[PDB]
Paper text:
The 3′-end processing machinery includes the highly conserved cleavage and polyadenylation factor ([name] in yeast, CPSF in metazoans). [name] interacts with Pol II during transcription, monitoring the nascent pre-[name] until it recognizes specific RNA elements. It is reported to contain 15 different subunits, including the Ysh1/CPSF73 endonuclease that cleaves the pre-[name], the Pap1/PAP polymerase that adds the polyadenylate [poly(A)] tail, and two protein phosphatases (Ssu72/SSU72 and Glc7/PP1) that regulate transcription and 3′-end processing (1–7). Computational analysis revealed a protein–protein interaction network in which subunits are organized into three prominent modules centered around the [name] enzymatic activities: nuclease ( Ysh1), phosphatase (Ssu72, Glc7), and polymerase (Pap1). The poly(A) polymerase module contains five subunits: [name], [name], Pap1, Fip1, and [name].
Next, because of the central role of polyadenylation in 3′-end processing, we developed a strategy to overexpress the polymerase module in insect cells for structural and biochemical characterization. In our cryo-EM map, three of the four subunits are well ordered: [name] (residues 1 to 1357), [name] (residues 27 to 411), and [name] (residues 1 to 94). [name] forms the core of the complex and is composed of three seven-bladed β propellers followed by a C-terminal helical domain. β propeller 1 (BP1) and BP2 are each formed of contiguous sequences. The C-terminal helical domain of [name] is located at the nexus of the three β propellers, further stabilizing the fold. Our structure reveals an extensive interface between [name] and [name], burying >4200 Å2 surface area. Almost 50 amino acids in the N-terminal region of [name] are inserted into the cavity between [name]-BP1 and -BP3, forming contacts with the tops of both β propellers. [name] is anchored onto the complex by an extended N-terminal segment that binds in the central cavity of [name]-BP3 and continues across a hydrophobic external face. Next, two of the five Cys-Cys-Cys-His (CCCH) zinc fingers pack into the interface between [name] and [name]. The cryo-EM structure of the [name]–[name]–[name] complex of the polymerase module has a markedly similar architecture to the eukaryotic DDB1- DDB2 and SF3b complexes.
Author numbering:
A (entry chain A): 1 to 147, 193 to 320, 326 to 351, 358 to 380, 383 to 441, 496 to 607, 610 to 1296, 1303 to 1329, ...
B (entry chain B): 1 to 94
C (entry chain D): 27 to 388, 391 to 411, 466 to 470
Amino acid sequence: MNVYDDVLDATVVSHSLATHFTTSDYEELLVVRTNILSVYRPTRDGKLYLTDEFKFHGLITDIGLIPQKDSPLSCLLLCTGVAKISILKFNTLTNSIDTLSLHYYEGKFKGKSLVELAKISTLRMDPGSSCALLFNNDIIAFLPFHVKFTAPSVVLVASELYEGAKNIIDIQFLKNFTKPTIALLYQPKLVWAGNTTISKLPTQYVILTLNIQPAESATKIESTTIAFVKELPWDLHTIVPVSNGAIIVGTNELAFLDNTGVLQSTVLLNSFADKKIINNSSLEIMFREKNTTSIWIPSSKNNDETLLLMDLKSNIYYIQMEAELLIKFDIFKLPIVNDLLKENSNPKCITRLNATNSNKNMDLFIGFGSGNALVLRLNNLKSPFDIELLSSLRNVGPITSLTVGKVSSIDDVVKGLPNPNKNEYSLVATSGNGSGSHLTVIQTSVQPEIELALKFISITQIWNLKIKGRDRYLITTDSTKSRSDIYESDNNFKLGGRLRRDATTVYISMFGEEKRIIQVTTNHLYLYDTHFRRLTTIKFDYEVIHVSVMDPYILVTVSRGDIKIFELEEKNKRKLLKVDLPEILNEMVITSGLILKSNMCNEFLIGLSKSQEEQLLFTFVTADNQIIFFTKDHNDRIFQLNGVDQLNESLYISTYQLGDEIVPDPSIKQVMINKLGHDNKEEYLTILTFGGEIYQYRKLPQRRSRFYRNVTRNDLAITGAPDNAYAKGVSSIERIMHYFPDYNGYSVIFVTGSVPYILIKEDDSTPKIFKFGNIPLVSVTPWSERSVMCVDDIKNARVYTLTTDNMYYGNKLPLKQIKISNVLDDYKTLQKLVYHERAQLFLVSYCKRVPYEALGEDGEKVIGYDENVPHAEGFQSGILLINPKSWKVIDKIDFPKNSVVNEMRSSMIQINSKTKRKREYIIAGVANATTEDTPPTGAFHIYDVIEVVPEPGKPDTNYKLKEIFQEEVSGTVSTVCEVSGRFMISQSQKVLVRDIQEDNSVIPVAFLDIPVFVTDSKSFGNLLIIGDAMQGFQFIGFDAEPYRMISLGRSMSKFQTMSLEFLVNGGDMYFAATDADRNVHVLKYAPDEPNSLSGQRLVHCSSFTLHSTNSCMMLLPRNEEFGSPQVPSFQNVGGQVDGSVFKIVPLSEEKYRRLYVIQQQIIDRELQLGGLNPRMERLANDSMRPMLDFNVIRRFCGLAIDRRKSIAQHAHFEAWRDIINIEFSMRSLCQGK
Amino acid sequence: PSLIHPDTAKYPFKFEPFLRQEYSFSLDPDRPICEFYNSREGPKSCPRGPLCPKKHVLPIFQNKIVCRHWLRGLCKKNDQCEYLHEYNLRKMPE
Amino acid sequence: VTQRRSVDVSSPYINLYYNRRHGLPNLVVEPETSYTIDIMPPNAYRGRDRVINLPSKFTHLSSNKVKHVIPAIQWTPEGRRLVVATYSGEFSLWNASSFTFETLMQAHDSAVTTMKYSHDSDWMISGDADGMIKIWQPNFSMVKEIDAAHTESIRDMAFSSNDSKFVTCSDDNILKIWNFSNGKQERVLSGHHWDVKSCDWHPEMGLIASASKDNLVKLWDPRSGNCISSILKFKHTVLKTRFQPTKGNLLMAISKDKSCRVFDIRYSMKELMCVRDETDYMTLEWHPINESMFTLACYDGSLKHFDLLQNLNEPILTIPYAHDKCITSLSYNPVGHIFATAAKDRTIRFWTRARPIDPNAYPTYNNKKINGWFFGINNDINAXXXXX
Ligand SMILES: [Zn+2]
Ligand SMILES: [Zn+2]
């Protein structure tokens, strides 16, 4: 009984298409991460600015654009998991995606395939824009279009299309044909390197000119066979269509097959290809991908077309063409002399984003499955060309491993004062898969760099002032002691007089184009010159609470609820004038008012209608929750943000109408429309609830009157709860938002409280709240240029400025790229990172992909020994000890060739069994990854991290890995886990628990025969889950005094297990084991149940289809924020190959049943994006109590407050108080020792 | 708390009473060997019985020399074996 | 100290659960033997690369020292050992790790006609040339020696998907579904006018196929003793029957007649491929991980590997002189990496997956020593075909 939340949302760019979708104005680069479709508008500078982000409940397997009639903005087509086409029109009015048609094929496909369907059902679009096919493995769906939107869809096996076509290698639609044409590249007899000796030239390529004849009930498909090619290289895997005809990108051979059929020319790419124009290339390049990414660009204003192909090793290959007959056919590796694609690998999708009406000087986005998804600019095309990294989209690679560890809190005191992230751990990933692989510190909190830190006495609110841009005068105040003392630039008091120093000031700021100073003290407003002297004083009958300032205006809200707006007399700027505000709001009950300058309701105004200029409008929040506003020249015509009392997805501005619908339920404490992001300063209405809940609406560039928030996208995590739930986050320090136009270029909204939040928009993403340090924050003030001073609850003010050097502020959690692979040595691919608390430092096992040497136990190579050919990628591992204070690699302990540290864990192994002195040792399970027929070699390497004398120059190098014990043992050491003071390592089908003695003599003590290979092992005290590579997993108890590895329960459903890990939730324990089939299986050990057979058969209670193969699942404690922790509960934080990080946070059976009522009520009542029912989606074939997609629960959080309270089936509050318990489960990382 | 490796041997389970009855294995790994218990009789010797907080050594585990058959995962006598079912090199005939 | 041919998937699985743990896709192997690292372990390959884990490379011939006629062959589901039945009535146990025999268990009083492990990968039913069957632990200890299993010698065992009940068949015309946990027969299967030569249980749904000398496969229901459909497509006698152990979507049945058929339980009991070999087929086994891939074997040896998505009319890979004599029994380890097969020549041959380059790949009729020292430290060897 669990919830699944993406802690870090997916980031690996799998698919991307640059065609008008959101807006017809600019060419929009849609980018599929894996479940998150994000629409970017590339600028002339290249930087991708996100217009609209969409989170689909289900993996976007493949995407394409089909143009729709009557409208310029082209419809989208995405595939969800195994064969599930979703047609998507972007509705301009709602600014969200509506499904035109959903097409389930998974059912129809199983009824045609005799084999299991391939997980990645690949989609193909036709250039004629008439029929888009979806093929799995020899089985094809055809989705025709009328030129309703979609014609009734057919499903047919390739044997129905062509007489042969026995197993499809790749289909692609071909260029320039009147009626649409597929080109089925297939093998009748299947052939790999091994079948090559008997079957020669055994790939058949057939072009079939389809006759898509659609009837309104069901379509009939007859395929005219225009061309049949019989004898082609076995390796031909990808068909890429070019105007003259298809290119076939094979592993070793690359054959151009024209539209008429006959092979015009083929290029032998390397040494492995052999066969009619033959082109022999000695440049040993190979396309070892099953489907190689390839950007084909047509000619414009011409006979100049380009096709670029990409190796997995991330090399661009421009292929030359001459359409006439075909001459000039050769591949060319583009000279990447400035290695910027070195940091990337596994290119998944290339797309040209800027058309420039010319084939040369192209800007193209390449999405990578490893490195950052780069936007390149190719400047020329030669057979003075230079590529440049025009823009970057941050990709957290495949998150190879994941471990909690202190990256901050390593310094207990920084700049004198205590650390902002004191007693704060953060789960650090190992992103990247290649020469640009890097530790990614997936931080729970924004780690802010301190410029200046000073201790303060008896203060609560700070107001620094920049008299001429430079900060010169700082103001401190106290609510309790009743005093407001004024500091300086060098932080010295009374520098300076005539202030209301004896009473609590509420607001002090620059005024009248940085000449005057307004001090609003509780009872008396004041006006000052640059040098402080009282010029104008305004008295009030009631105590001033809410107060805002723009350049020529002050607004004050008194204790009664009455508001007063004041304008500066601009002619001399001395005295103050009362603004004749509309009398309509005097009857209204105002909670908080803010002066605002944005072009939000300028369309509704009589002056500058459709002009786009920031008219100064005074926003207010009514007690019945609606943002009312007006300009100075209002003429009693007041505007409102309509539908905030419900706070629904759309948020249009209209004229305010007063009646008797007044329900004083205040839930908008602070509201602000602010430009956000370092480059693309997008306006954002940002509601803050009295329950410390932040809602954030976007001002839409088209129709600026209408505001909209992506409810489906879970960008902003829930900071609070509306129905007084999570009161702990609001009752301590009052939640007040502070907008800063420049914090480090980045425009942010700081949110003060016990838990501080920072709304950071990056260009790459929707603006996200992040936890701002572990420390509480009382009040923020903008320190001298691109810096913000923040004061602690303990009154320790620190000038912070966000790091941008390697940080990224999308992915719904702030993350720090740590490139430890520097210039002098690149540790390509970082695997199985582990933190070591006894030394407070990280260990990561690098694994350089060495040229593999195929040899037995003897030094002689196996008989197929060839040196001229390019060798296969083997393994050359090694551990790096990294001290995270400096993040320099301290100690490199390399391993022999063919060796790879499959798993490495820091333990608490017992040194003496009687004494129970658990010294923290790391154990690296290295395995000599070799051929199947070579004897399996492996070694477990145990390391004690010792305080060594540091090198005279650099500090932090005061630790070195000490090889206390290593043993090159029979069988592959594929996993290590510390089972209660003893560590088990895997072997070939064996698991030996080793015990470490005080003499460092390590003896195996307990033994267990496992089914075929351990992928992953985890221990929960003296329990174990030893994951069998295809035979599910053994759940294993472990005894000591008589060392018995007692087999407790095999997983009944046997599956290719990916990463095991426990999730306990009290009482009976549950195990999450992920699959090769991207599927979490939660199995509980229930020996109480009779069907479970004494526990020996684990009851498979929940399956949950992920959006990626879970690379490393990892247990860490969860923060029970609302409730009290009687039993230490553990959530389950798993990485993803798509660069997501999920939490399988488990729940109480009461707690879950509340959310499962919500989930089932959200899916049914509220519509999803691609029409995809998440409960139906997150299921593949191995109890009716499913794991909950929190991505669909946080839709309840994004839901309209009226409908939200309606969905309660006393329980609404009880729901919220545990929805926070799921989102705040990661905040356990903010508690140390 | 201690977030980086909190494996926690002292976690309470619903199957903790079961694992004392069957398998003779409690959630405390290196718990002491209980007094007033002999392997020859079984649960009848101990006053606490099967739900004993301390551990119960089986006749197979107090046996001297290790099993060659169990070491290769195929001993006919899974219980009442004249050899040991504990893989320690101290008690080994090579 | 002494080196031996060690076909062990553990090393490739690392290479897999690295490539899978980084999303670095299953790299297409190139002809040169360095690429043998990227031959990922069988269940890594599905679809247009299944032909990789199709077993063609002769690995090892072994004989049980005493040289006895093997009645049945079944792998221990963990993939670790191959259990070899004996006409003497013993379980010879050739492990996968080295192709060396572990101790003979001496199972039954007479010859063990068949043995089969549970899908829970623990228990195994054996059988006899007398009536009896025995329930075994994976560590081989006779849990329930059911003496009065059948009036005649049993023929084939098969477990349910939940392995809570299993089917026996015999030289008696009737089948018995035994409720496994009690060791008593739940429902008897009244049908077939002649002896039930073989039977198999569908590995997902409740369905039991039954090869009979009545030349028909009746498809029984476990809940009630009646056949839901009787396939009448066979002519002489249905010799054996199986399913795809993975999905179960395809039932298969071999004949003592030249014919052989593969069916769909999914689609109205339709046949897909009526393959006829001039030399009569004897035994079949589906590739344990790759649906629509199996191996038939003939009276002329002829280890004929097939695919339902490559050639319906034809075998994919013929090994025409695999064994000297008629192959009686064959099984893949559920891993898929080794495919063991035994004949009435009293020798059990193991067949691994191919390795991208070897001159002895495709051997074809070896005169004196077909088992000519293949454990010589290395996988691949040069050429005529036999060594020493
Ligand atoms: Zn006792
Ligand atoms: Zn024994």
